Write a protein that binds this DNA or RNA. Structure first.
Ligand SMILES: Nc1nc2c(ncn2[C@@H]2O[C@H](COP(=O)(O)OP(=O)(O)OP(=O)(O)O)[C@@H](O)[C@H]2O)c(=O)[nH]1
Lengths: 81, 49, 327, 146, 48
RNA sequence: ACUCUGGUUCCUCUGCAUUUAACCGUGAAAAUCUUUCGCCUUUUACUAAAGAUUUCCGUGCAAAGGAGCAUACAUUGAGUAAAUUUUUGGAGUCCCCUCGAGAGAGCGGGA
C-alpha cells in the first residue's frame, strides 16, 4: 500500500485480535476485528455490545462507520510489531 | 506432490518458478513465454480436475 | 528403502552420524511377492489333527485393480456389511451376494488378499461357522504372510472357503486344531492354483533430446525395461521418456544412463505396479548355476531358489507333503 | 563431468578403483587382498547378480555399495544440476529473443484450457487506464545488438 | 525460494553471488549432494 | 538550525581473515616427524601413498597516517515546512425534569 500513517498500520495488525471500541453515541463494542479500513471503518465479529447504562448484548456481526468511532483499545502484542 | 496433497485434503496453490529460464535460457520471446506459463497452469488444472 | 539414493543417504548417516563402525553391505535385492495365476483346479481339503473337522478352500487370482484399492485403503474391512457390499457392486459390478460374505483381508487389514465364505447355508449354521470364523481368518492371515514357495508374502490371491465339518468340541478344537489346519488348506489351495512370483516395478521419467532417446532405449533393453511415452516436452528442447523397469534390474540404471548420455539425460524412479516374474518357480527342469546367465524361464526359478537359500530354507518346495496322500 | 569431477576421483582413490581415463594411485589400505576368503558372507549361492555392480555404481553411490566406509575417506559427488538448455544462435541477424525450431512447440493436444474469469463486458468494458499509465519500459527496445 | 524469505526477514543472511545458500538444507550430506534430503521447518513473520 | 569531509591515485604501518560441507588461491611448490612398497656391498639424493606440522609464491577487507597529481561546497554519520458525506474549516447553541450548596452526568425532553 501507499504509506498511510502508523496508527492505521497498527489498526490492520489489530485485525487478528480482540479490540474494544467506543462509538460517539457512547456504546462500547468488544469483538474480534475481522476487517478494518484506512478510513477506520471496523467490522467486528463475535461482538458484545455494552450500552452506556451497563446493559450488554451479544451481536454476531457489527459494522461501525469509521468517523463514528471514538477510540479503540488494541491488544498489547501490537506494541512489539 | 499435487496428487498426494489432494488426498491429504491439503489446500493446493501453485507457484511457477525459475521464470528466468524462459528469457535467459530458452529465449522464448514475450508472447511464447506467456503460452509456456499458460500451458503449465493448464497441466496442473488437468491433474486437479 | 525406496530406491538407490535413499539407501545411500541412509547408509551415509549410519557410517558418519550414528554407528561409526565397520559394516558389511550385501548386494541390493528386492523382496518378492507370491501370486496365483489360475483358479485352483481342485478344491483342496485339510482335516484337523483330531480328524473331527474338515476345511476346504480354493485359491483364485484377484480382480486386477483390487489389490491397489486394498493397499491404498480405498476400501477398508471395517465397512463390512452395508458399505463394503456397496463398494464392490458399484466399482466392480460384482459378486455382491458373495461380497457380503467377505469379512477378511490378509496378511493384515490392508493386505492384498481376500478370504470369502462361500459355504452354502444348508451345510452349516452361521453361529457355528461364526465361532470358527475368527480362527480361520488367523490361519489365512498367517498363510498369506509367511507361507508358500519362498516364504515371501502372498499377494493378489482371493481365497474362497467352502466346507462344513465342525463338531461338539469348541474349546479344544477352536484354537489349536483349526488355525494350523486353515493354513495348510490355504497352501494346498494356493499350490494347486499354479503359483508364480511377483517382483516390484518402477516407473521412470527421463529428459534428454536427440541422441539420448536412443541411449535410453538401449539401456532399458539391457535391464528388461520397456518404454511407453515419447513426449516432445512443450516449449523445451528436451524430449521426455517414460518407461517401466523392474526394481531388481534398476540398481545400475541411473548411473548407466548418465554415462552413456554423458550426463545429458537424468532419470528419477518411482514405484507402482507388481508384475509377474517370467517362468515357473516350480519347474524342476530348470537347474540353476550362479556362474551363468539365467534369462527368460530361469528368472522365476533362480529368484525362488536363491531366496530360499538366503532365508536358509530347504532347497525345493514342500508341495508333496502339503497335498499329502489323500488329496 | 558427472562420473569425472573431483569427488568421484577422491572416492575412486579411497575405494582403490580406477575410473576409465582417470588417475590411479597406490592402495590406501594394503590389507584388503589378504582378507579374501569367499565362503561365509560372499558365498554367491545366495545372491542374485542381475548385472555386474562393478566400478561406476560403487563410485556414484558409495555408501550403498562399499564395505569399510568409515576408515576410507569416501566423499560424495554433487548429485545433479538441472541441465541448462541454452541453444547457441549462429545467425547474428536473428532477433535476440526468437523461437528456436529446436525448441518443441508449446502445445499439448489433449489439454483442457483453463477457464479465464475475465470481467464481464457491459460495465467493465467502460473501465479505462489513466492516460499516463504506461508499460514500465515502453520505449526501451526489447533487445539490442549487444 | 525459501532463501529469499530468509534474506528478507533476516538482513544478516549472506547469500553468495555464485551459488545458493540453501539455508533449509542444513545437513552436510545435503550441502554436498545439494539436493534437499530431509524436510526442515522455518518460522518467520512476513507481511502481505 | 550542527560537527563534518575536498576528489582520485600511490606508499607504508596496524587489525581481522578457525563455525572450514566448501573457498582467504576457480591456481598449486618444497621441507620435517611418524608409517607402508621398490633401488643399494654405504649415506644422501630417491620411488608413491597416508596422517600430523612448518616454510615459501601469493590473497581479501577494514581502519589510520603520510606523500603526490588535476581543485570545489554543497553534503555524509546527526533532523523540518489539500473549506462540499469517514478526521485538517462546526449539527452547533439555548430552555425544562433528575442528583445536589457548588458543577456536571442520564441513547432524558424540546426550539
Ligand atoms: N536458472 C535458474 N536456476 C535456478 C533458479 N532458482 C534455483 N535454480 C537452480 O536449481 C538448482 C536447485 O535449486 P534448489 O533451491 O536447491 O532447488 P530444490 O528443488 O530445493 O532442490 P531439492 O528440493 O532437493 O529438489 C540450483 O542449481 C539452483 O541454482 C533460477 O531462478 N534460475
Amino acid at each position: 500500500m501507499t504509506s498511510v500513517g502508523v496508527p492505521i498500520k497498527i489498526l490492520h495488525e489489530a485485525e487478528g485480535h480482540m479490540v474494544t471500541l467506543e462509538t460517539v453515541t457512547g456504546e462500547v463494542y468488544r469483538g474480534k476485528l475481522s476487517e478494518a479500513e484506512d478510513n477506520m471503518n471496523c467490522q467486528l465479529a463475535e461482538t458484545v455490545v455494552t450500552f452506556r447504562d451497563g446493559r450488554s448484548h451479544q451481536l454476531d456481526n457489527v459494522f461501525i462507520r469509521g468517523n463514528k468511532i471514538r477510540f479503540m483499545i488494541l491488544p498489547d502484542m501490537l506494541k512489539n510489531a | 506432490a499435487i496428487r498426494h496433497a489432494i488426498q491429504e485434503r491439503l489446500a493446493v496453490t501453485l507457484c511457477i518458478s525459475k521464470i528466468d529460464r524462459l528469457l535467459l535460457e530458452l529465449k522464448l520471446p514475450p508472447a511464447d513465454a506467456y503460452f509456456k506459463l499458460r500451458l503449465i497452469i493448464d497441466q496442473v488444472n488437468n491433474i486437479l480436475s | 528403502g525406496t530406491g538407490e539414493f535413499y539407501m545411500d543417504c541412509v547408509m551415509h548417516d549410519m557410517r558418519k552420524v550414528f554407528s561409526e563402525i565397520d559394516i558389511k553391505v550385501a548386494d541390493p535385492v528386492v523382496t518378492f511377492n507370491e501370486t496365483v495365476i489360475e483358479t485352483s483346479t481342485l478344491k483342496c481339503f485339510a482335516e484337523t489333527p483330531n480328524k473331527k473337522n474338515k476345511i476346504t478352500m480354493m485359491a483364485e487370482p484377484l480382480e486386477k485393480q483390487l489389490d491397489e484399492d486394498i493397499e491404498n485403503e480405498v476400501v477398508q474391512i471395517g465397512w463390512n456389511r452395508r458399505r463394503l457390499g456397496e463398494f464392490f457392486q458399484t466399482k466392480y459390478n460384482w459378486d455382491l451376494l458373495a461380497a457380503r460374505s467377505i469379512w477378511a483381508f490378509g496378511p493384515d487389514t490392508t493386505g492384498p488378499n481376500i478370504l470369502l465364505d462361500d459355504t452354502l447355508p444348508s451345510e452349516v449354521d452361521k453361529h457355528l461357522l461364526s465361532t470358527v470364523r475368527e480362527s480361520l481368518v488367523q490361519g489365512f492371515q498367517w498363510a498369506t504372510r509367511e507361507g508358500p514357495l519362498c516364504e515371501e508374502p502372498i499377494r493378489q490371491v482371493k481365497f474362497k472357503l467352502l466346507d462344513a465339518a465342525i463338531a461338539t468340541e469348541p474349546l479344544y478344537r477352536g484354537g489349536g486344531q483349526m488355525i494350523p489346519t486353515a493354513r495348510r488348506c490355504a497352501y494346498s489351495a494356493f499350490l494347486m492354483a499354479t503359483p508364480r512370483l511377483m517382483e516390484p516395478y518402477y516407473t521412470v521419467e527421463v529428459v534428454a533430446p536427440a541422441d539420448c532417446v536412443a541411449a535410453v532405449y538401449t539401456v532399458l533393453a539391457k535391464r528388461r525395461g520397456h518404454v511407453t511415452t515419447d513426449a516432445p516436452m512443450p516449449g523445451s528442447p528436451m524430449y521426455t521418456i517414460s518407461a517401466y523397469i523392474p526394481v531388481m534390474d534398476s540398481f545400475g540404471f541411473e548411473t548407466d544412463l548418465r554415462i552413456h548420455t554423458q550426463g545429458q539425460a537424468f532419470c528419477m524412479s518411482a514405484f507402482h505396479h507388481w508384475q509377474l516374474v517370467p517362468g515357473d518357480p516350480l519347474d524342476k527342469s530348470i537347474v540353476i548355476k550362479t556362474l551363468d546367465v539365467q534369462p527368460t524361464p530361469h528368472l522365476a526359478r533362480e529368484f525362488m531358489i536363491k531366496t530360499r537359500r538366503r532365508k536358509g530354507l530347504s532347497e525345493d518346495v514342500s508341495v508333496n507333503k502339503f497335498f499329502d496322500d489323500p488329496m | 563431468f558427472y562420473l569425472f569431477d573431483m569427488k568421484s576421483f577422491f572416492t575412486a582413490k579411497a575405494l582403490n578403483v580406477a575410473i576409465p581415463g582417470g588417475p590411479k594411485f597406490e592402495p590406501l589400505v594394503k590389507d584388503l587382498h589378504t582378507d579374501e576368503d569367499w565362503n561365509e558372507f560372499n558365498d554367491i549361492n545366495k545372491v542374485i547378480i542381475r548385472a555386474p555392480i562393478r566400478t561406476e555404481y560403487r563410485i556414484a553411490f558409495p555408501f550403498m555399495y562399499n564395505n569399510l566406509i568409515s576408515s576410507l575417506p569416501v566423499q560424495v559427488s554433487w548429485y545433479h544440476t538441472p541441465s541448462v538448455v541454452f541453444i547457441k544462435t549462429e545467425d547474428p541477424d536473428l532477433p535476440a529473443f526468437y523461437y528456436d525450431p529446436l525448441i518443441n512447440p508449446i502445445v499439448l493436444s489433449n489439454l483442457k484450457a483453463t477457464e479465464e474469469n475475465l470481467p464481464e463486458g457491459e460495465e467493465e468494458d467502460e473501465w479505462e487506464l489513466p492516460e499516463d499509465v504506461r508499460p514500465i519500459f515502453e520505449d526501451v527496445p526489447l533487445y539490442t545488438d549487444n | 525460494f525459501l532463501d529469499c524469505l530468509m534474506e528478507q526477514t533476516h538482513p544478516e543472511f549472506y547469500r553468495a553471488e555464485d551459488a545458493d545458500a540453501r539455508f533449509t538444507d542444513i545437513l552436510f550430506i545435503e550441502k554436498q549432494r545439494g539436493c534437499s534430503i530431509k524436510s526442515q521447518p522455518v518460522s518467520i513473520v512476513a507481511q502481505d
